[PDB]
Symmetry: C2
Subunit: 386 residues, 2 copies
């Protein structure tokens, strides 16, 4: 036995509410001024939504703009005030007060040493590692049910998956053996007994399309609302703050991590651009067949736009070329300057027909087929290495 | 030819002010009621401090008490309104408005939440820490100390970055740094101080720090002091801060994965805090015993379950003897790892000046200090039995 675990939380989780609100602001500003510099932090303290930070933009937001945006975000997440949950059980949009400390300033005239990582692996869907992939599948399925059935389930949902790899050697070779344990936490209406809640999410677990080679219900340990009573949920009972789900939003502990949060920020911060470029490179490398998994590490220096270096680590799973040759290829064939990355993924141009930052905030920064930094448009260039 | 960089910020950084305020609340509640349950998050911006989250304690805290706590914390961090910086340039205690938007909450004792946590250790630097963050930390501590004693010159919102050259990937994997490639220090100074003088001052502090001579040569290492030039404005007055937004700086500086869960704001029943301390303690004892050059320990929990749902160790290929399967089994079989076991192992419910204080840990980093109970090598002999 050799175990590894990852977690995911839904868009209804308080920290995600804060992330989705913050990146709704980013989207609005960028839609109207592409060169907006945004650092918009959100603290959902119960029924108090506190928006702070700083924005340099030509687009300005009124108090009503903030009120509308918060209510529309909460509604789309699932906090629509239908009243299946009492307003003391669950956040009700009417009870919210929005408090704005956000500082607006004019754009600067003509508007770091560090590292960022990306990662990819062949273990599971969209080249993501196993534990977080399967935790995401379960969460997505329970959240989707809760939205369709607010009379039964609430939208503040967490999941956790433990994978048994058997031996460390299988972990190194990307060879998961079984899903060992599944944890699901989902709130339900006051009138639903715990036995009936467990029966429901058990059905949802089986309908989450988990691979049968890994998942046997009879041999898997399943823990559903283990404390036995979970009705009260949302930011009312657990504070939410922006940038507090770094690992559920990325690689679930399978990769080292540097820098800081994506949400709250525009594309000019390497916390965004470096993660997206790093992930894009890693995904295309594994998708090309050069490795079973790899970690891509961008390094930046003061006074250079181009990264001082980019290093590829295939963690011993190389098929064709060693890590030195691969790193050299990457540095020589991709500029990877902030502006090149911006233009490569169109990061200054979020739109409903491409990607939205509020959408990525809700679904994960990495690991969804439709994002631009998840496109396999470098595959032909990498295939030249074999 | 193989670069790596970590960064540290001082207690004067807005995110750290938030962390330290939050953990000052944890300290006073636990001091007077050891079963207090605390999730007191903090947001700081401009002249505002907002406290939210949940608290359950027999020690009652008034609005005046919260106000006074906030001002006292800010004063001890170094924002004391002495007048070297104006109330427009950095935070003055007498100008802050405090809002308190707190609610109520909602081994045999089950874990307080699900989640994952990682401990890490490495034989590279003091106290089994990796090099770049160790040296970054050393420099930041030194500059912050100087600033607190000379507030007529420097502000206390400080940042340091250290870039290590390893030479090659192989050396990085075997914990062999070759040189410090770059040192970056950023500090505010008072309006009257010329940039040249700020730089002269900081240069001395770097040169007289205890950096190893093996790695540091002041004629080969590039030293950058205030890359964007002079600035006077600093503190949360000018950039917002939030609890739990320095998780990498407070731990392993890029050399390890993290769980994602924060430490500051929380009592010891939150496994996001306690599981980091237990992971780190295991990883440190494993490396100090000579079983690996570096080690990552993963723990996970499920809400309402006491025993961890998973325990795994990863020595990143650096094992000297036993493999990672045997190590993971040994840990599982010899250390209970329930919340109560962790609480009792490190006496987390009994903070004190002579042991540890949460607010002090917030300001000094969550790991890497000799005096923390989870930095003690008291499992050393147990792990040395695996050497054969």
């Amino acid at each position: 036995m050799y175990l590894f675990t990852s977690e995911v939380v839904s868009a209804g989780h308080p920290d995600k509410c804060a992330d989705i609100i913050a990146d709704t602001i980013v989207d609005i500003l960028l839609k109207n001024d592409k060169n907006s510099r945004v650092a918009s932090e959100v603290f959902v303290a119960g029924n108090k939504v506190v928006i702070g930070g700083e924005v340099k933009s030509n687009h300005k937001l009124s108090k009503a703009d903030y009120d509308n945006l918060v209510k529309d975000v909460l509604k789309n997440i699932g906090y629509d005030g239908a009243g299946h949950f009492s307003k003391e059980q669950c956040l009700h949009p009417d009870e919210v007060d929005v408090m704005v400390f956000l500082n607006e300033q004019s754009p600067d005239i003509n508007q770091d040493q560090g590292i960022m990582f990306g990662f990819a692996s062949c273990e599971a869907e969209e080249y993501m590692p196993a534990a977080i992939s399967y935790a995401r599948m379960l969460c997505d399925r329970v959240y989707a049910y809760a939205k369709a059935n607010p009379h039964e389930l609430g939208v503040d949902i967490k999941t956790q998956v433990t994978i048994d790899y058997g031996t460390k050697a299988n972990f190194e070779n990307c060879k998961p053996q079984s899903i060992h344990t599944i944890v699901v936490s989902a709130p339900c209406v006051e009138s639903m007994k715990i036995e009936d809640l467990r029966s429901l999410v058990m059905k949802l677990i089986l309908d989450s399309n988990l691979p049968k080679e890994l998942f046997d219900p009879n041999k898997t340990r399943i823990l559903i609302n283990p404390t036995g009573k979970y009705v009260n949920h949302s930011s009312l009972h657990d504070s939410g703050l922006t940038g507090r789900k770094l690992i559920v939003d990325s690689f679930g502990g399978y990769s080292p991590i540097g820098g800081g949060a994506q949400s709250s920020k525009d594309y000019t911060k390497v916390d965004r651009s470096g993660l997206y470029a790093g992930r894009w490179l890693a995904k295309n490398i594994v998708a090309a067949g050069l490795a079973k998994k790899c970690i891509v590490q961008l390094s930046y220096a003061i006074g250079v736009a181009k990264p001082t270096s980019v290093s590829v680590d295939c963690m011993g799973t190389n098929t064709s070329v060693n890590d030195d040759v691969l790193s050299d290829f990457v540095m020589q064939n991709f500029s990877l300057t902030p502006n090149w990355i911006r233009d490569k993924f169109h990061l200054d141009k979020p739109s409903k027909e491409t990607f939205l930052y509020a959408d990525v905030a809700a679904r994960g920064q990495v690991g969804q087929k439709d994002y631009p930094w998840e496109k396999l448009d470098a595959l032909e260039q990498f295939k030249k290495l074999l």
